[PDB]
Amino acid sequence: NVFQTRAGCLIGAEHVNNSYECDIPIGAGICASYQTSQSIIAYTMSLGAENSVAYSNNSIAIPTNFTISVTTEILPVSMTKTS
Amino acid sequence: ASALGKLQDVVNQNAQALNTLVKQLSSNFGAISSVLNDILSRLDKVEAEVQIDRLITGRLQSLQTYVTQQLIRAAEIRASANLAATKMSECVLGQSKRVDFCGKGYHLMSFPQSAPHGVVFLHVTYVPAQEKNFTTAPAICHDGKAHFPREGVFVSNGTHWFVTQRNFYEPQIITTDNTFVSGNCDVVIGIVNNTVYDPLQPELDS
Amino acid sequence: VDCTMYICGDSTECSNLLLQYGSFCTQLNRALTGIAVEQDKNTQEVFAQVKQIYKTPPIKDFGGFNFSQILPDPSKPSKRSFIEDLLFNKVTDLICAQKFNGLTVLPPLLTDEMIAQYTSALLAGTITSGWTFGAGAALQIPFAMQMAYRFNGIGVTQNVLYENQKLIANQFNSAIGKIQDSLSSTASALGKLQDVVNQNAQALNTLVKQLSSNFGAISSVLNDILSRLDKVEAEVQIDRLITGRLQSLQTYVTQQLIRAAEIRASANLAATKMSECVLGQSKRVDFCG
Numbered sequence: 215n216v217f218q219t220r221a222g223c224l225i226g227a228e229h230v231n232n233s234y235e236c237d238i239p240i241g242a243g244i245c246a247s248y249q250t251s252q253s254i255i256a257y258t259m260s261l262g263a264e265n266s267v268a269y270s271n272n273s274i275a276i277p278t279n280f281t282i283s284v285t286t287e288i289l290p291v292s293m294t295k296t297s
Numbered sequence: 298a299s300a301l302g303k304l305q306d307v308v309n310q311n312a313q314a315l316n317t318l319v320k321q322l323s324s325n326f327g328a329i330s331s332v333l334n335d336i337l338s339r340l341d342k343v344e345a346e347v348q349i350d351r352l353i354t355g356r357l358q359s360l361q362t363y364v365t366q367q368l369i370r371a372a373e374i375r376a377s378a379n380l381a382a383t384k385m386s387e388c389v390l391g392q393s394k395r396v397d398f399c400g401k402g403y404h405l406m407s408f409p410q411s412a413p414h415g416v417v418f419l420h421v422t423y424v425p426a427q428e429k430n431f432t433t434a435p436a437i438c439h440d441g442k443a444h445f446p447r448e449g450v451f452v453s454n455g456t457h458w459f460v461t462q463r464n465f466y467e468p469q470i471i472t473t474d475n476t477f478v479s480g481n482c483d484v485v486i487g488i489v490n491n492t493v494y495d496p497l498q499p500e501l502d503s
Numbered sequence: 504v505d506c507t508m509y510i511c512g513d514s515t516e517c518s519n520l521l522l523q524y525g526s527f528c529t530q531l532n533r534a535l536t537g538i539a540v541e542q543d544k545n546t547q548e549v550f551a552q553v554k555q556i557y558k559t560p561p562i563k564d565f566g567g568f569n570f571s572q573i574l575p576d577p578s579k580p581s582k583r584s585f586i587e588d589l590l591f592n593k594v595t596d597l598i599c600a601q602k603f604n605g606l607t608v609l610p611p612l613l614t615d616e617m618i619a620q621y622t623s624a625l626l627a628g629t630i631t632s633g634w635t636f637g638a639g640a641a642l643q644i645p646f647a648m649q650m651a652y653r654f655n656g657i658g659v660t661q662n663v664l665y666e667n668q669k670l671i672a673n674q675f676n677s678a679i680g681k682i683q684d685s686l687s688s689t690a691s692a693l694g695k696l697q698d699v700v701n702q703n704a705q706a707l708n709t710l711v712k713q714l715s716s717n718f719g720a721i722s723s724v725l726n727d728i729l730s731r732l733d734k735v736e737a738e739v740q741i742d743r744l745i746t747g748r749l750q751s752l753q754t755y756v757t758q759q760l761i762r763a764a765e766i767r768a769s770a771n772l773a774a775t776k777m778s779e780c781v782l783g784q785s786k787r788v789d790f791c792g
């Protein structure tokens with residue numbers, strides 16, 4: 215089962231006209247994922263989900279309620295010293 | 298296992314190049330063997346002086362490869378360490394007005410946590426949630442003066458004009474303490490017709 | 504780069520010798536892949552900070568500000584704002600020549616058309632939703648009531664904009680226009696980009712031309728040394744080619760590592776601006792210009 219891509223000749227993954235989040239990055243937007251029996255697929259990555267803000271010159275949306283989220287952020291500091 | 302990938306990678310890449318540095322002791326480099334002495338005891342030294350070059354020339358290079366790596370990799374950590382000092386300084390010891398420097402949402406505080414050869418911040422960020430579509434106006438005529446909010450914006454749910462703070466919905470009736478006067482009713486684009494209640498006027502009536 | 508091929512073209516004779524230098528061939532790929540990976544991490548960090556793809560509303564009323572310049576062009580096949588086309592013309596065989604010897608150009612994970620969807624989103628949310636889309640769900644707000652805040656940010660009371668709006672409109676639009684000619688009439692504005700692209704194509708040329716150098720060997724054609732000379736001796740010759748070429752890769756590789764580390768620094772500067780400047784409003788003097 216062969217498919218031609220932008221990035222080259224792909225083999226053993228069924229093309230999918232649907233477009234989902236990029237999962238295993240390949241090249242030029244082609245991104246593969248395992249799920250449907252099952253077979254590796256290849257599809258044009260959807261960048262993001264789509265939204266269109268509902269906008270009019272008098273229209274404002276003010277949040278009535280909030281969350282407090284704790285997002286871990288991780289950074290190196292030092293590396294193993296050697297001589 | 299993945300959230301530490303940044304750290305786990307750094308520890309890996311060193312032991313990687315450390316490994317590869319070691320394996321280079323087993324390579325011929327063109328010389329007849331990769332054991333130093335086994336070249337010697339096989340040949341009379343005036344030949345070994347030639348061979349041991351191709352060992353040294355090989356190994357010496359393999360160091361300068363490994364070393365020049367570390368320098369580059371060191372700077373990579375170096376910039377990351379500078380970023381950690383910046384976050385440690387600004388995020389934890391301050392409150393960062395910078396946006397998405399401390400993570401998505403408006404930032405409240407961070408709690409650092411040590412990790413092997415690294416640091417882990419817990420960013421406590423304030424994310425709004427539930428929204429309600431509001432008709433708004435940038436201004437409000439009263440007597441022909443214009444009234445603008447000191448902080449926040451004039452909104453209404455469709456009848457009563459409320460001024461509220463921006464990042465949370467907290468409607469309040471519109472009085473002079475909410476609004477300051479500037480200009481008049483011609484210029485503003487979008488000003489509406491309303492009545493700004495006065496704290497003082499009732500206080501008089503007795 | 505393919506280390507075994509670039510060094511030893513189509514010769515097992517040379518290919519076997521390369522095994523005696525051990526992991527050089529492999530650790531170069533491990534090196535360049537580290538670059539090649541994070542390049543699509545850079546482009547990832549910079550452009551996609553936004554959870555969703557926003558798109559501008561069908562009808563444009565911003566209070567007089569004309570974004571048709573900067574917004575995606577609905578009539579181009581690849582939708583890219585009128586300005587971006589000015590850029591893609593300025594910046595620019597090397598198409599297969601490099602690709603002869605094992606110098607490959609891998610496609611960037613994100614196609615340019617995708618990059619133009621992000622920079623549409625970021626620009627679509629900036630216009631409609633103010634700065635709130637970086638902190639969570641985007642909040643539609645009247646653009647003219649956005650600019651009342653961004654004046655409060657810089658200390659100018661909002662009553663200036665509600666009164667000067669028409670004027671500020673023209674100053675904005677007439678400012679956008681000159682951005683075209685600033686790009687259109689001078690090709691040196693993009694030098695920063697143009698320098699990056701050149702230096703990459705530069706070293707590749709140099710890296711290729713190193714194939715034609717003797718490096719002390721009798722010839723630069725790997726087969727001629729095998730054709731003319733009996734192997735016993737040709738072994739020593741091919742060393743000077745390999746040692747020369749194999750070194751000449753580490754030179755190229757080390758350059759890329761160093762040069763990428765610069766871009767890696769420049770990428771963060773963008774991702775910093777993109778987050779602080781675009782998505783928020785910056786209080787840092789002359790960080791945004």
Ligand SMILES: *[C@@H]1O[C@H](CO)[C@@H](O[C@@H]2O[C@H](CO)[C@@H](O)[C@H](O)[C@H]2NC(C)=O)[C@H](O)[C@H]1NC(C)=O
Binds near residue numbers: 456457
């Ligand atoms: C908009 O909000 C205002 C503020 O509460 C509403 O006005 C009140 O509406 C309640 C309805 O239960 C009445 O009991 C109060 O007497 C009203 N107070 C005032 C000062 O008007 C208004 O009804 C809301 N309108 C909409 C369409 O949501």
Ligand SMILES: *[C@@H]1O[C@H](CO)[C@@H](O[C@@H]2O[C@H](CO)[C@@H](O)[C@H](O)[C@H]2NC(C)=O)[C@H](O)[C@H]1NC(C)=O
Binds near residue numbers: 488489490
């Ligand atoms: C707010 O009230 C003012 C009057 O105080 C309105 O201005 C007049 O509106 C009428 C229509 O109702 C027009 O025929 C007049 O020509 C307007 N004034 C003048 C001098 O031309 C205004 O339209 C009302 N609505 C606003 C401005 O929000």
Ligand SMILES: *[C@@H]1O[C@H](CO)[C@@H](O[C@@H]2O[C@H](CO)[C@@H](O)[C@H](O)[C@H]2NC(C)=O)[C@H](O)[C@H]1NC(C)=O
Binds near residue numbers: 563569
């Ligand atoms: C925004 O500006 C563009 C051009 O910068 C305007 O497009 C022009 O519209 C006029 C119509 O009067 C045409 O004669 C021109 O040929 C158009 N030029 C281009 C390049 O398309 C556009 O109308 C402006 N829109 C707003 C809302 O300001």
Ligand SMILES: *[C@@H]1O[C@H](CO)[C@@H](O)[C@H](O)[C@H]1NC(C)=O
Binds near residue numbers: 228229230231
């Ligand atoms: C996608 O749809 C086209 C028709 O528009 C069809 O030719 C093609 O086979 C489809 N792709 C797959 C993977 O089924």
Ligand SMILES: *[C@@H]1O[C@H](CO)[C@@H](O)[C@H](O)[C@H]1NC(C)=O
Binds near residue numbers: 268428429
């Ligand atoms: C505001 O109006 C838009 C119009 O499409 C709607 O989709 C949205 O759900 C409304 N807001 C809320 C909180 O329902």
Ligand SMILES: *[C@@H]1O[C@H](CO)[C@@H](O)[C@H](O)[C@H]1NC(C)=O
Binds near residue numbers: 270271487564
């Ligand atoms: C807002 O836009 C509507 C078009 O839907 C228009 O009728 C109205 O006059 C505009 N108001 C202002 C203040 O721009």
